[PDB]
Fold this protein.
Amino acid sequence: KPNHFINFPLAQFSGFMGKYLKLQSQLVEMGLDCKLQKAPHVSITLLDIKADQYKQVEFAIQEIIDDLAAYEGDIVFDNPHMLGRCLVLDVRGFEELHEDIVEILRRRGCTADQSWIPHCTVAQFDEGMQFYHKEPFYLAGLELVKIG
Amino acid sequence: PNHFINFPLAQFSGFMGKYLKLQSQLVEMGLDCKLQKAPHVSITLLDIKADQYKQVEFAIQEIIDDLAAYEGDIVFDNPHMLGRCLVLDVRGFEELHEDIVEILRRRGCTADQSRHWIPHCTVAQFDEERETKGMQFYHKEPFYLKHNNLLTDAGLELVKI
C-alpha cells in the first residue's frame, strides 16, 4: 500500500503543454534548485495490486474508455502551490471519472483507495506563481503504471 | 583523461542571468535535454595520482596569487553544438590556461593535450546529437579581483573525473 497507479498523461494536450513548459521555463529563470517533471500527468487512483490482477485493471480502464463521452467536460489547471517538496497544480474535472473507476476497481476486487485531491506535479524542489488552463476534454489516454 | 582544473561561473550574477535565460528558452521549447546546474569553464585536464593533489593545490594557489595578471574580460558567445552538448565559446582565459599548465608541469603534473585547447561553457547535454536552432547568446564579464572586499570569493578548483 500503495504499489501501482492509474495514470492520465497530459503530454498529448499541446494547449496545456504550452503554458506548462512556460511555467517550468520560469522556474529556471529564477534559478531555483529544482528537478523539472518530464512527463506531466495526473494520477487518477493509487492501487494495491498483485500481478494476477492486471487483467482486472485493464477491463476497469477498458470500461471507462468505452463510456468516455460521459466524462466529457472541462479540465482546469490552476493555483500553483507547494505540496511538501513538490510544486503542484490543482486539477478539476476528473472527479466523476475517478469515483467510477474506483467502484469498478473494487467491484473487481482491486483495492483502489476510495476515501483524494487531484494534482499535477511541476517541479521537485530540493528543500505566487500564476497558472490557468481550461481544457476541453471532449473526444483514450489511461495507463496502468508501476511505482516507480 | 583523469582530473580537471575548474573555473566556476556561478558567482558571476551577470553571466548567470543570461545563462539561466538561455536554459529557460530550452525548457520553453520543450527539448529532451538535461540542463547543467553548476556552469564552469575547464581550464585544463591532467593525469594526476592522489599523491599529486598537494602539488596541484600549490599550482592553483600560485596562479591565484598572480590573479591580477589575468584581469580582463571573459567573453561568452556563440551557442553552438559541440558533440551532444549545447555549449558557449569562452574567451579571456588564454594566458591563465598557458600559465597554470607551465606551473603544473614543473610541479611534475602532466596536464593538457597536444591537440589545440578550445575553452567552452556547457549549457545543456542532449540525448542524441540534436539540433542547433538559431540560439543566441552574448555576454562580457569583467574578471578582476576586488580591493575593498577582503572577503574575496571563489576561483580555481581541482575536481574528480
